Amino acid sequence: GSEIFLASKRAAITYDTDPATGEPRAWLAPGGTGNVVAEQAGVLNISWIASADSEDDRRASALNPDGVTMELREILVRLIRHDPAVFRNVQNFMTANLMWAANNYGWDRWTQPSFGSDAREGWADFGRFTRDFADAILKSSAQSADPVYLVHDYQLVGVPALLREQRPDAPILLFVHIPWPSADYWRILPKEIRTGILHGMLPATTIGFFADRWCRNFLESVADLLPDARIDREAMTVEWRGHRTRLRTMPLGYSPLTQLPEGIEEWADGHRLVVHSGRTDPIKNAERAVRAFVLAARGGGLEKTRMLVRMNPNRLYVPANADYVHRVETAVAEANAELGSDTVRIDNDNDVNHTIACFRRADLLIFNSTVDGQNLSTFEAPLVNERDADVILSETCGAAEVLGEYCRSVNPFDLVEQAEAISAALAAGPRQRAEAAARRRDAARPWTLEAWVQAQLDGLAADHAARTAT
Amino acid sequence: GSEIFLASKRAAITYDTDPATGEPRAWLAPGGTGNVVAEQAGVLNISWIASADSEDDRRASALNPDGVTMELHSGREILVRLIRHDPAVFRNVQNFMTANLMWAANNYGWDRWTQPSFGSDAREGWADFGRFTRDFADAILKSSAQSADPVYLVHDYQLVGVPALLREQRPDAPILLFVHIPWPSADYWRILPKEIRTGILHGMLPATTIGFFADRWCRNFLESVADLLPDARIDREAMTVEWRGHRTRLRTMPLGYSPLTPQLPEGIEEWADGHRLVVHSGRTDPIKNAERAVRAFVLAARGGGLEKTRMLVRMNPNRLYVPANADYVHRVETAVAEANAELGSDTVRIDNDNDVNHTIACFRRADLLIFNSTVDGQNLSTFEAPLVNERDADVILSETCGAAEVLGEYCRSVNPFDLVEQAEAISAALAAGPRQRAEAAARRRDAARPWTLEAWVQAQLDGLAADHAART
Ligand SMILES: Nc1nc2c(ncn2[C@@H]2O[C@H](COP(=O)(O)OP(=O)(O)O)[C@@H](O)[C@H]2O)c(=O)[nH]1
Ligand SMILES: Nc1nc2c(ncn2[C@@H]2O[C@H](COP(=O)(O)OP(=O)(O)O)[C@@H](O)[C@H]2O)c(=O)[nH]1
Ligand SMILES: O=P(O)(O)OC[C@H]1C[C@H](N[C@H]2C=C(CO)[C@@H](O)[C@H](O)[C@H]2O)[C@H](O)[C@@H](O)[C@@H]1O
Ligand SMILES: O=P(O)(O)OC[C@H]1C[C@H](N[C@H]2C=C(CO)[C@@H](O)[C@H](O)[C@H]2O)[C@H](O)[C@@H](O)[C@@H]1O
Ligand SMILES: [Cl-]
Ligand SMILES: [Cl-]
């Protein structure tokens, strides 16, 4: 019976009042990673450590600082109250202003970025935030004789080294949900950050990414920057200062637990509907999707076709995100002016059910990200689509390593190639689409949240034996 | 006695009239690669094929289509054959090869999030590029038709397509392709449209030897090959590619400077007198990073100790018609204007003119040299400047110049994107005492001195000879 300790920046919690009693209710969101882990047979018990980012979180933390047991089987939820100034700066450190641009290829080098004092301060703040997490995690696991640590996502990259210092023999997995960039791009970052982040990650027993390309890039970055590290590209390992680290690819597609926005159905009725969906993040590439649709339309055959750009607002305070929405609006305005009024609409709202409705209704799905750690939407959409919609998928999504063969895989920067794919996908007959969609669904279906959790547990257990042995 | 055939986009030629007779003169520029090659002991004779890009070049080609026997000292003659491309094709290819396309691709100018977005303009550019490549191959083969065992040396990126076409006609010839600019990471290389990112690799790989100035570029190339050609096999240790029966060797052959390498630009000396002089020099190309140099200088000044210090931004105008170059000059001007407004009038000057002698004078006069490129294929300036500097100037060198693989230890190596690190290096370099600078400069000069044009040519000939045996 392993005692599991899960850490991630955000723990999904729902705060409300009972409709009958009016009593205040805090209750964990269904299908959460912690909930799934709670279920593997091996697991005796689990605690979950995350950041308090809301007033409610804050209150709950003060209220139960050691933590609160949450019934589901039970998982102990411990929220961290960071210093507010530090927490916010770290949030800006993790945004397209810094680390998001670094792992998601947002910088052109010729003009950006130019690191100043702000970068040094952001890094200092990042160390303090990392220390909070490590301390909360260790404290939470103090009684445990054999704690298993699962650290999730980029914000926590510094945590493994600090865990390892206090717990030299613990299984530590770090899972990164976003890409890792080429060695030349990774080293854009200031010296203390580009080496310092590698110092924090490498003491993990296992580092996981969604895609092989990300493991390869990671290993090249290590090789490039730490002259004392030894990488093995075949074995996927790093040996560094007596640290042996295993890199693993553990793809995720979707959670088995997965109506239209106002006026969309009637607006779409009588037309084929091209759907592009993603957060208001420049990587999602909706501007280029729209320009590509416009080029396809010029080719003809698209007269009864409409396009919906479905966006979920996120991080709009970040200039790059705001500017992306501005570029999307511009391209959509210009598409209408040329093609005809109301050919293209944006529907920008945070309602996951609406988006799923868009997925079902689509006659063509476009997930053409400039880059993407994985992209779960491209697994969800074909699985719920009832129209035998083709999928246009960018070759730079991690998901392309699993589904690329089953989709129209495109260079997300080539408007011509993407236009041609849109024309071909729409020209394709019902029987051909129907058969391709069934192949597509079968390729997507196995990659479930649960298999992903199992992959982590097994891969960790196995890497722990190896590390223990060498 | 090997018969050598050299190809490059441009062949440095001087057109003028004899000052005594008034007769028209065309003579090869001294210190040229072709001139150097002709001097090697192995070489029996050499021809040089290049593009006509001037009206003079054009008239010369029409008058001597087969070629022209240009004269060298020591009674060594190099045959020079200029190609008259179709003008429309030639100009578009110039645009393809401009930051508008291929330059941004090998020199990391694209943010991915907003640029680039390839259109029909790229497809046409590629078609034009095939036609330009076919002209070169035809001129080169024709020029070598009589030769029993022609040795082909193909220089620079514009000719990347040439080796495959040479190999088709001449399956057993030694073919070297030397690329003078960086090769980008696999993920960045594959930004380019499918027919370009694979088609360029198809063009290069049949060469016997592919050379770059730096190991990083060879590694990136190999990763690109591995990423895009599932039928290729790479060997990172051996530095080789095997692809469709083609065995290709990658080599790093660093170049520093030509031993053949004055006075300051008007008013620079008096303006600089009484002050320590920070010098940054490069073409008006965004990779040269002068904007960031200036911002870093400003941050250094805020720290104090720089009160008697001035900065000169020496630029050589080039490709100003390309928007990214014009915009770079615009960002530089802005930063220089803002530096003056904050630090004091005339603290920083730009001197932007095409006069190599002026730049060399700037190198001699500098109390601190800054070559902080965002990326560079090599950067010869960083080798030339220390070698002529009389002031024991420190050198701030970007870790992303190919030259950093030879000189990085002997310079203040910096991340070109970190204004803070670069400001600190400027303060430290200027704070350093005369004895420390003197000793560092002598070690710097010793590290730079061996990397001559001639050694580089010899490296190509030997490396090719050796790779030809292996491939054979
Ligand atoms: N909260 C919210 N989630 C959404 C909305 N639309 C889609 N989603 C989903 O959020 C996830 C998006 O993840 P993914 O495609 O991997 O891209 P990511 O945003 O970079 O992590 C998927 O599970 C989608 O179902 C929305 O409007 N609101
Ligand atoms: N024509 C010309 N050449 C210059 C001038 N200033 C410097 N140079 C030379 O041009 C070369 C610059 O090459 P390098 O630093 O390798 O950068 P590149 O411009 O990217 O190839 C050096 O040989 C310089 O000495 C100038 O004003 N005009
Ligand atoms: O909550 P935010 O506004 O900070 O951003 C939403 C998520 C985006 C990013 N999602 C990733 C996760 C996943 C799925 O786990 C991948 O499919 C995505 O490609 C990748 O962008 C990021 O990694 C997460 O930490 C963020 O919470
Ligand atoms: O075409 P131009 O003259 O506007 O550009 C000047 C040169 C810049 C570039 N010079 C390279 C040569 C060298 C040395 O030959 C490297 O040191 C530089 O880093 C690299 O930028 C390019 O490769 C050449 O083809 C160009 O002629
Ligand atoms: Cl890169
Ligand atoms: Cl990259």
Which residues have CB under 8 Å from A184's CB, separation 6+? B108, B184, B185, B188, B216, B220, B400
Choosing from A177, A210, A214, A378 the residue with most ligand 3 atoms within 8 A of its CB, the one to mutate for a pocket test is A177
Identify whether residues B210 and B298 lie together within a single domain: no
Question: Of all atoms in ligand 4, which is nearest to the CA of residue B401?
Answer: 19
Identify whether residues A7 and A107 lie together within a single domain: yes
The H or E element spanning position A353 is: helix A352-361
Which residues have CB under 8 Å from B145's CB, separation 6+? none
Number of C-beta neighbours around residue A360 at 10 A: 15
3-class state of residue A15 by DSSP: strand
Identify whether residues B205 and B334 lie together within a single domain: no
Report how far residue B405's alpha carbon sits from residue B383's, in angstroms, rounded to the nearest whole number. Answer: 12
Query: How would you write chain B as a 3-class SS string?
Result: CEEEEEEECCCCEEEEECCCCCCEEEEECCCCHHHHHHCCCCEEEEEEEEECCCHHHHHHHHHCCCCEEEEEHHHEEEEEEEECCCHHHHHHHHHHCCCCCHHHHHCCCCCCCCCCCECHHHHHHHHHHHHHHHHHHHHHHHHCCCCCCEEEEEECHHHCCHHHHHHHHCCCCCEEEECCCCCCCHHHHCCCCHHHHHHHHHHHCCCCEEEECCHHHHHHHHHHHHHHCCCCEEECCCCEEEECCEEEEEEECCCCECCCCCCCCCCHHHHHCCCEEEEEEEECCHHHCHHHHHHHHHHHHHCCCCCCEEEEEEEECCCCCCHHHHHHHHHHHHHHHHHHHHHCCCCEEEEECCCHHHHHHHHHHCCEEEECCCCECCCCHHHHHHHHCCCCCEEEEECCECCHHHHHHHCEEECCCEHHHHHHHHHHHHHCCHHHHHHHHHHHHHHHCCCEHHHHHHHHHHHHHHHHHHHC
- Alpha-carbon separation of residue B353 from A171, B277, B380 (angstroms): 62, 19, 19
3-class state of residue A78 by DSSP: strand
Identify whether residues A427 and A464 lie together within a single domain: no
Amino acid at B127: A
CA nearest to B72, candidates B35, B25, B18, B44: B35
CA nearest to B248, candidates B186, B176, B162: B176
Identify whether residues B224 and B319 lie together within a single domain: no
Report how far residue B219's alpha carbon sits from residue A454's, in angstroms, rounded to the nearest whole number. Answer: 36
Question: Of all atoms in ligand 3, which is nearest to the CA of residue A398?
Answer: 19
Q: Which residues in A lie closer than 8 A to residue B101 (C-beta atoms)?
A: none
**CB within 8 Å: B187 and A105:** yes
CA nearest to A15, candidates A50, A48, A54: A54
Residue with CA closest to ligand 1 atom 26: A352
CA nearest to A108, candidates B281, B341, B112: B112
Residue with CA closest to ligand 3 atom 19: A373
CA nearest to B56, candidates B82, B35, B19: B82
B287 and B374 Cβ atoms separated by less than 8 Å: yes
Instruction: Please give, rounded to a whole number of angstroms, the shortest distance from the CA of A271 to a CA of chain B.
Output: 27
**CB within 8 Å: A106 and B113:** yes
For residue B360, the ligand closest to its alpha carbon is 2
Max distance between CA atoms of chain B, in angstroms, equals 69
**CB within 8 Å: B118 and A416:** yes
Distance B204 CA to ligand 4 centre (A): 19
CA nearest to A113, candidates B416, B452, B468, B104: B416
Question: Of all atoms in ligand 1, which is nearest to the CA of residue A378?
Answer: 15
Report how far residue A383's alpha carbon sits from residue A361's, in angstroms, rounded to the nearest whole number. Answer: 12
Place of tokens 């479930």: A448
**In this complex, how many residue pairs, one in chain A and one in chain B, have their CB atoms less than 8 Å apart?**
120
Report how far residue B89's alpha carbon sits from residue B324's, in angstroms, rounded to the nearest whole number. Answer: 22
Identify whether residues A417 and A432 lie together within a single domain: yes
Tokens of B88: 């429309």
- Chain A nearest-CA residue for B121: A416
How many residues in chain A? 470
Does A304 count as an annotated binding residue? no
Identify whether residues A383 and A238 lie together within a single domain: no
**CB within 8 Å: B112 and A106:** yes
Name the residue among B111, B418, B420 with its Cβ closest to that of A108: B111
B212 and B183 Cβ atoms separated by less than 8 Å: yes
Q: How many domains does chain A fold into?
A: 2
3-class state of residue A272 by DSSP: strand
Identify whether residues A254 and A265 lie together within a single domain: no
Query: How would you write B351-367 as a 3-class SS string?
Result: EECCCHHHHHHHHHHCC
Q: Which residues precede gaps in chain B, with C-N > 2.5 A?
A: 261
Residue with CA closest to ligand 4 atom 25: B156
Identify whether residues B142 and B273 lie together within a single domain: no
Number of C-beta neighbours around residue A441 at 10 A: 16
Give the angle B10-B13-B19 at the CA atoms, nearest 5°: 165
Name the residue among A114, A182, A324 with its Cβ closest to that of B417: A114
Identify whether residues A234 and A285 lie together within a single domain: no
Q: Which residues in A lie closer than 8 A to residue B324 (C-beta atoms)?
A: 110
For residue B325, the ligand closest to its alpha carbon is 4
Identify whether residues B230 and B285 lie together within a single domain: no
Tokens of A460: 């960790």
Report how far residue B421's alpha carbon sits from residue A392's, in angstroms, rounded to the nearest whole number. Answer: 43
Distance B147 CA to ligand 4 centre (A): 31
Per DSSP, what are the bridge partners of residue A409?
A: A393
Mutual orientation of helices B194-204 and B120-143 as an angle, nearest 10°?
10
Number of C-beta neighbours around residue A354 at 10 A: 19
For residue B74, is it left (φ>0), alpha (ψ between -120 and 50) or beta?
left
**CB within 8 Å: A115 and B418:** yes
Instruction: Please give, rounded to a whole number of angstroms, the shortest distance from the CA of B269 to a CA of chain A.
Output: 31
Q: B112 and chain A: CB distance < 8 Å anywhere?
A: yes
Between strands A344-348 and A305-312, the pairing is parallel
Tokens of B122: 């790229």
3-class state of residue A128 by DSSP: helix
Distance B108 CA to ligand 6 centre (A): 9
Identify whether residues B300 and B215 lie together within a single domain: no
Report how far residue A382's alpha carbon sits from residue A362's, in angstroms, rounded to the nearest whole number. Answer: 10
Q: Which residues in A lie closer than 8 A to residue B421 (C-beta atoms)?
A: 115, 190-191
Choosing from A352, A359, A360, A375 the residue with most ligand 1 atoms within 8 A of its CB, the one to mutate for a pocket test is A352
Q: In whole angstroms, how large is the CA radius of gyration of chain B?
A: 23
> In this structure, what are the phi and psi dihedrals at residue A108, rounded to the nearest 5 degrees?
-100, -5
Instruction: Please give, rounded to a whole number of angstroms, the shortest distance from the CA of B464 to a CA of chain A.
Output: 29
B8 and B50 Cβ atoms separated by less than 8 Å: yes
For residue A109, the ligand closest to its alpha carbon is 5
Ligand 6 is an ion; residues with CB less than 5 A from it? A 182, 185; B 185, 187-188
- Chain B nearest-CA residue for A284: B113
Structure resolution in Å? 2.1
Tokens of B131: 């036609």
Interface test with A, best of B113, B224, B414 (most A CBs within 10 A): B113
Q: Which of residues 234-263 of A touch B (CB under 8 A)?
A: none
Domain that holds residue B241: 1-262+450-472
A156 and A9 Cβ atoms separated by less than 8 Å: yes
The answer, yes or no, to whether any atom of ligand 2 lies below 6 A from the CB of B356, is: yes
Give A266: exposed, middle or buried? Use CB within 10 Å, 0-12, 13-18, 19+.
Answer: exposed
Name the residue among A105, A191, A415 with its Cβ closest to that of B112: A105
- Which spans in A155-190 are helix H? 159-166, 183-186
| Alpha-carbon dihedral sign for residues A245, A250, A255, A259 | positive
CATH number of the domain encompassing residue A308: 3.40.50.2000
Q: Which residues precede gaps in chain A, with C-N > 2.5 A?
A: 72, 258
Q: A370 and chain B: CB distance < 8 Å anywhere?
A: yes
Does A377 count as an annotated binding residue? yes
For residue A100, the ligand closest to its alpha carbon is 3
Place of tokens 């004091």: B344
B137 and B165 Cβ atoms separated by less than 8 Å: yes
How many residues in chain B? 472
Name the residue among B123, B190, B191 with its Cβ closest to that of A416: B123
